[PDB]
Amino acid sequence: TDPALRAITHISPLGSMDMLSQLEVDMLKRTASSDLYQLFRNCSLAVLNSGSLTDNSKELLSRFENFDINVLRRERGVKLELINPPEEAFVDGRIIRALQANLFAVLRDILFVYGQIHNTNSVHITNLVFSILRNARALHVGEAPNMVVCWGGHSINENEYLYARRVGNQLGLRELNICTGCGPGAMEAPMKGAAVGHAQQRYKDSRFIGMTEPSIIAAEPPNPLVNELIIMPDIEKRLEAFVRIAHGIIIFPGGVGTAEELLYLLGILMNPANKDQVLPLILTGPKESADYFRVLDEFVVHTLGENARRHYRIIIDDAAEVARQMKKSMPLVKENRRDTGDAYSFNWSMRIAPDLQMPFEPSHENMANLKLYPDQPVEVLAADLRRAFSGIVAGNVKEVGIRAIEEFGPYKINGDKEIMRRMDDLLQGFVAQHRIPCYEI
Amino acid sequence: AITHISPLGSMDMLSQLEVDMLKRTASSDLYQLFRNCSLAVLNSGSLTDNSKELLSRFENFDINVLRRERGVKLELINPPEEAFVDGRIIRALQANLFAVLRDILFVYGQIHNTVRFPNLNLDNSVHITNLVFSILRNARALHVGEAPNMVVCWGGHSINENEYLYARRVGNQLGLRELNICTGCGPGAMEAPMKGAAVGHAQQRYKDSRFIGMTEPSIIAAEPPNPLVNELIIMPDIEKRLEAFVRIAHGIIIFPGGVGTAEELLYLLGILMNPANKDQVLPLILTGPKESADYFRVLDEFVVHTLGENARRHYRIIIDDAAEVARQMKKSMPLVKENRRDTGDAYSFNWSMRIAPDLQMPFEPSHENMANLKLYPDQPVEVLAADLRRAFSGIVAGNVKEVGIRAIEEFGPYKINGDKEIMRRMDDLLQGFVAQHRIPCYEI
Amino acid sequence: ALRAITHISPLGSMDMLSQLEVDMLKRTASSDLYQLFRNCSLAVLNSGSLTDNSKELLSRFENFDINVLRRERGVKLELINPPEEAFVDGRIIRALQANLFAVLRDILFVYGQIHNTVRFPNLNLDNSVHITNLVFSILRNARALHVGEAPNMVVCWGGHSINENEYLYARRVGNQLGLRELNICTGCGPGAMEAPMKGAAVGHAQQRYKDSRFIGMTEPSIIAAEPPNPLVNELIIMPDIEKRLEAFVRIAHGIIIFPGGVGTAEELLYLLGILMNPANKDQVLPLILTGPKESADYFRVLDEFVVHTLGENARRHYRIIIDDAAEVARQMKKSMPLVKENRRDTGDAYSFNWSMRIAPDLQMPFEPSHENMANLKLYPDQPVEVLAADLRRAFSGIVAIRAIEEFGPYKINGDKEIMRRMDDLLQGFVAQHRIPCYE
Amino acid sequence: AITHISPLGSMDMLSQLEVDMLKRTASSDLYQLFRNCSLAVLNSGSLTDNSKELLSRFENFDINVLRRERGVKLELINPPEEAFVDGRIIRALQANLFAVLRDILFVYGQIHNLDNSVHITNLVFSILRNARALHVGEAPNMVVCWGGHSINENEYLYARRVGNQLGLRELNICTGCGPGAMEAPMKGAAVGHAQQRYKDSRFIGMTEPSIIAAEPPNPLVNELIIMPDIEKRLEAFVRIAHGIIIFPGGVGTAEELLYLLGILMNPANKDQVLPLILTGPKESADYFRVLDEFVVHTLGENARRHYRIIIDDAAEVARQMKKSMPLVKENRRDTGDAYSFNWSMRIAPDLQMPFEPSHENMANLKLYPDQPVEVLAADLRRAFSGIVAGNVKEVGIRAIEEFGPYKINGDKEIMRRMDDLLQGFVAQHRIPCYE
């Protein structure tokens, strides 16, 4: 169909999409013909660009502008044609199996999942999240709890990396499996250690999950350790499924996305209906992360109240203790699901409120109608804080309207201007570690 | 009195909104079916080989879909006590039960009533086949990369002592060569193979036997599955049952099943003698003990006179040579593997096989419909055999079923019209089958 | 598609062999041991025998001969005129392939080596520590003892020929036993040694147990005549009946004795003489005797004989169930966790009962010389352990001659009431069809 | 300060009379070997690379053999605390420890003919069989990876790069259990196995009682074998490998490449397939240059049918290695040889025998081109094992002052190449001790 020089390879499916119905295959193909192709292409490039020697992002992706991918139809199932893929993703002309699987992964979540809902109620949003993970063969039936979600920051310095490896090698010396946001630095070090420790302790089925969104994976290649890759429709459905599959959470330094994620966490942990649930939240870093955490906690205790630190707990420069506590909490998390009658792998009990599930358009009017009142209940005040925060993080990676920072005025944030005064040094502090301007009186 | 069972195999990871949907559907009129089938599942291997008498004893039995946050459970109010060893359900029985929950409630209920999958008109043949595939994929029944070894084994409900022995032997041979059996879940001809194949898999240290039994809600409800069946599948109607028999077999051995097997072959030949399927490899062997000779042959004549010597290519008869039937099968696998390899086709499912729409949809033997059934030699062989199958479906047991009798006492017998010699051959077959104990209800 | 010279590769036993050991196989194969290795190998290949014959079945293949090949990697086996039923489409049946290399394992590699070749010193073969440590290295080299194995092994004894009831019933015991995820070990033979495994199969099937272990133990003279039954997964051949019985005891976590005619009497008296010994008052080895309806009286006379000879203290080590298939499994399954605990507290292994003190008396083999028979001390002043040990050697010889015609009938210098119960049991067994041979 | 350990993998099912053998062997003079090797195994993974001083901290340590009816247990008096997690011994550390109980207490003590070349080879096999390292029915993927104890960072990176490429092709690594070049190949291999989903890595590390006494096994070694001497350690290196890859190990690579070319160039081994790739970074081009020159002159250019030199192409190093594997299988197939043990390879009994560098013997060593190539290299290795060892050991400093320097007989041109290679080896910083 094309006479040019176009290095091709035909890949068979590995670990997803393997048993496909015919009428599903058609659907896969008709979707790869829609406008969705760009995402499907750009994600598939980042998937084959994993663990690239050159530690770049935009420039790495621009080199392969000759790249393309096609969905090939066969009576049995389906195959992926790879025109001009990066050479590093192949050994002796065979695709590396990790990558293969993570490729067919992107077929699954971007063209099979993301297609059927986006190219076509908080109960629907959860059962749908469950369904995605079930289809991802990620909820293992009869699995004792060992999953420790690790949130963290895109860029991090050398000490912070070192310490997050140590937490990992510990987590792993205790036979605990890790999830992250499939990205780099903080989302990577914990697995990198947990492997070594998984090794030493002869653990034989290391789960290193990695949850992400269309807009993140299109630019950010999954770090190489990720052995299971899940892509969810939006951040909103990403954070929800983070929480539901976790048996522990360990926030790291990181800066902006972390802070935003913490508020998401807390406003589900402080809701009444969830005073019985057991999800250990240990924040941690290295010695030089002392002041950073400090001001974080100061911010929460001001906004949400001191009663908010019911739910968290800060260990500093004790890699071993963080893994020890996470290991001890695992029985309790089982039991706490035992007597609810709740799946060990999916926390159906945790009540996440529709405000936490509803997506925040980065529209200017959205922040201009935002509310920050101490009279608002702790839950509502925290959800609005998180939605403003996930909008700022989207203002550099989604680029849906980058010039709307001050297009007809600054984001009218009506309410206690002292909440913003606390974020003054907080936001500049993230800029300090390289992680009324935007608000309004 | 009341035991609560956990899932085993089927229904292990359920979404809440789904568990839920079971309990509603469990309350619908469908309930009696769900109960009947679950009582049958628990009465497998019953020391009493009684059909209706065995189930009528357990009238106090009843079953309840219980909801928990994790998943779903089953409440067993007065279960037959045999099915419990030291208080625990027999793991086999457990998994068969949760199979009835899968195909009876999550599968039958859902596609017939709630339009959750919209795009399913269930007349379009593409939709019927793809569905037959979704049913099977969900029963974890199709395996990816499973090199071909499934010998589907059609037979007869009641069979004499010799036929059993002979069919057990074929199974032993089949399983001495590491071939897995699939039957129609029942007793006799559908039990005897798996029963021997078991000793075969054993001697040959074959591990992970697959003894599939495929069935339909009316069959299972009256007839418990035989105790050997390892994977239970319940297809909505015979039509979907046969159609799935085809697609998942890599070989087919038709044992002697009385006048029933006659429409069986015809159905098989219908798809086989089709020009788009002149390339598909599907070993069709018939076989039987010494005495089954006469019975296979009188069949043979009829087929060749109605369809031709060309029909004799697709099948093969063998008699009292058990082993050779295992031998030809084990041989034909690699060719069947290949036949799929070049057509770019799944090993476990035969997508390419064109089963014809008139064979997918059901046929009702209305006295008007019967006589309009075109049966003459000009009409191509495909249509000839398929109408011959529908014509045999109605006239066979046209006197056993009291529906046929009452209707052939009102509107008269089946005055079918087509070609004189054909109704001669269609007769012959029945006069011989009657000679072998295997106005009339029919007319020219 | 097969010939009459076929070359079989190893399966499951003798897989990794050093060249110097490979040589040892061939030199022992050319020595006088050959007939044994020949007869046994024919036997193994004649399992699943469609024809229900014994000696007539094996005498038909006089052309069969087997030879030890040599390659650099290991050993292979040369089958010259094997029987055809043990091959399918020119492949050897994988069952028979193991059991063949099994016989190669124990008859030539073991029995050859330990008897004479001083390649292994420190083999007094009289010291009872040596016999026991030897029985271990056998079941070890036979990959028979599994590390970290929760106890599920139930040894079954019984009669090689049994009516159709005794078989049907022993089948049900198996079915139930199996349904509880228990593994059976018998003496490899027919009838009472087949039915437990035969049923045990179906229920292992119903309960999705995925590693049946139908062990069968035997000794060279028996297997030469009796082909193992088709169910046997592990074949193990022990040098003599004595070392076979010791290893029975060591591997069992339960012993059921079925209706084995007068053939079980020495069997029970063998168990008792280790169970009633002192240092074994803490050990946990359930001993049920069972049978179907008609076996009732057959145990009856039996139990009487033991009570009166050894005492009612022998009823401590056994129990008796009749026609309750289901129960004999239920109790057996129940006893497993206790058997784990008793080996646990004692610091002992689960697969091998080191701590049972088996009498050196019972380990050594018995000569029923008329002098030795008379000198056999059969008095109740002697302790119950030695009383049962001497009562067994008495029954093994008197029941199972040319010498009672040369010298005389077996005038045992025993206590008369012991001799009185002895003859009364023999007469009661004659009522059940199960000057005399004694005096 | 005491813990008790159960057996993991090694020594798990033992007969009672064997157990007794373990105890009395432990109480003898072999105790010190056991203890210092046991100590080193518990010291794997330590951040401190002061191999010796590390052991000097834990001089309180001691180790007792515990009897039980079931088997054996290991009492640990004052064990290093880092080798535990929440009181649980690290499983890796558990296993290698019992492997020292295996090869040092059980094996070494008991075996101490050993004079007949066939007896030595069958024993090396019985040692590898008891170590459960020979897998029956195993496609050949073992690449033995020789190298040097301390290498700079560019050889460490390069050796790692090799491994990753080896791994990425589903190939297992065998090394000398140490660090430096014996670690980076496995360390790489690790990352790669993962990427390709290779789920059964076999990072065999073989060694001798003297080596492991002071040196903790590097943390990647899955399976630890300890052979009695070096002579048997090498012979074993040879029979289990399917290829060999020689990293830049300084002058320590000289006798090695000779020993190997000895068995390769002997006649009866003209049909065996054992690839030999020598690789390294760019800094190693001169270093391999003089090595290859010295050989082409002494043994002939026929010797370069047996060794190939690749420099700075890690991919190809593996690519060829991975291509060789099917050929090494077939080569064992048609000979009727094991795929796990190269029984057919003829090792000459002199290469199996230890060489004592007595002034008399090294002078008696025949070193002239008149003798044949197989013998020449053998004597050349026995030459270098004393010559270069001269400038380091006292037998080549102290003995050459007492009875005079080493006046070797043979041919002058050979001795010229020898000295010329050495002068090379001094120039890359890797009458003297030799005349």
Ligand SMILES: Nc1nc2c(ncn2[C@@H]2O[C@H](COP(=O)(O)OP(=O)(O)O)[C@@H](OP(=O)(O)OP(=O)(O)O)[C@H]2O)c(=O)[nH]1
């Ligand atoms: N609550 C809960 N139960 C689960 C889960 N996964 C598996 N199970 C098992 O379901 C089985 C049914 O026992 P129930 O007592 O009725 O469970 P329930 O809490 O919902 O009532 C339990 O097995 P069991 O008989 O109790 O054995 P075991 O759990 O003690 O080992 C339990 O282990 C889960 O994610 N949540």
Ligand SMILES: Nc1nc2c(ncn2[C@@H]2O[C@H](COP(=O)(O)OP(=O)(O)O)[C@@H](OP(=O)(O)OP(=O)(O)O)[C@H]2O)c(=O)[nH]1
């Ligand atoms: N058509 C088809 N291919 C399948 C099936 N299952 C697995 N395969 C794999 O697909 C490979 C065929 O590659 P292609 O030759 O391109 O098939 P294609 O023309 O239809 O695209 C098979 O090669 P292979 O030679 O069969 O490898 P192997 O399975 O013997 O290892 C096998 O690895 C199936 O059910 N149908």
Ligand SMILES: Nc1nc2c(ncn2[C@@H]2O[C@H](COP(=O)(O)OP(=O)(O)O)[C@@H](OP(=O)(O)OP(=O)(O)O)[C@H]2O)c(=O)[nH]1
């Ligand atoms: N007696 C015996 N023990 C064995 C055997 N195999 C493994 N073990 C284990 O030994 C462990 C007990 O620790 P030890 O320190 O050795 O006991 P000991 O004092 O009697 O020597 C148990 O693990 P655990 O987890 O502590 O006990 P459990 O819960 O598994 O039963 C037990 O399972 C065996 O063949 N026999």
Ligand SMILES: Nc1nc2c(ncn2[C@@H]2O[C@H](COP(=O)(O)OP(=O)(O)O)[C@@H](OP(=O)(O)OP(=O)(O)O)[C@H]2O)c(=O)[nH]1
């Ligand atoms: N040389 C050698 N042979 C081994 C090894 N391991 C297993 N075998 C097998 O021994 C079996 C006997 O076949 P032969 O044809 O006699 O082998 P040979 O030439 O090497 O002597 C072969 O099985 P097969 O059924 O005949 O063929 P295959 O498909 O299993 O490979 C072969 O694979 C080994 O480490 N080395």
Ligand SMILES: Nc1nc(O)c2[nH]cc([C@H]3O[C@H](COP(=O)(O)O)[C@@H](O)[C@H]3O)c2n1
């Ligand atoms: N045993 C084992 N098992 C796995 O699954 C692994 N995945 C990645 C590694 C490597 O990660 C570390 C990288 O840290 P680095 O040395 O580059 O600074 C290496 O020390 C390696 O052990 C690894 N090791």
Ligand SMILES: Nc1nc(O)c2[nH]cc([C@H]3O[C@H](COP(=O)(O)O)[C@@H](O)[C@H]3O)c2n1
């Ligand atoms: N799961 C399992 N595993 C083995 O290893 C087996 N070996 C033999 C059998 C058979 O036992 C019965 C034979 O008795 P039959 O009724 O045929 O006379 C068959 O119905 C089979 O189940 C078997 N089953």
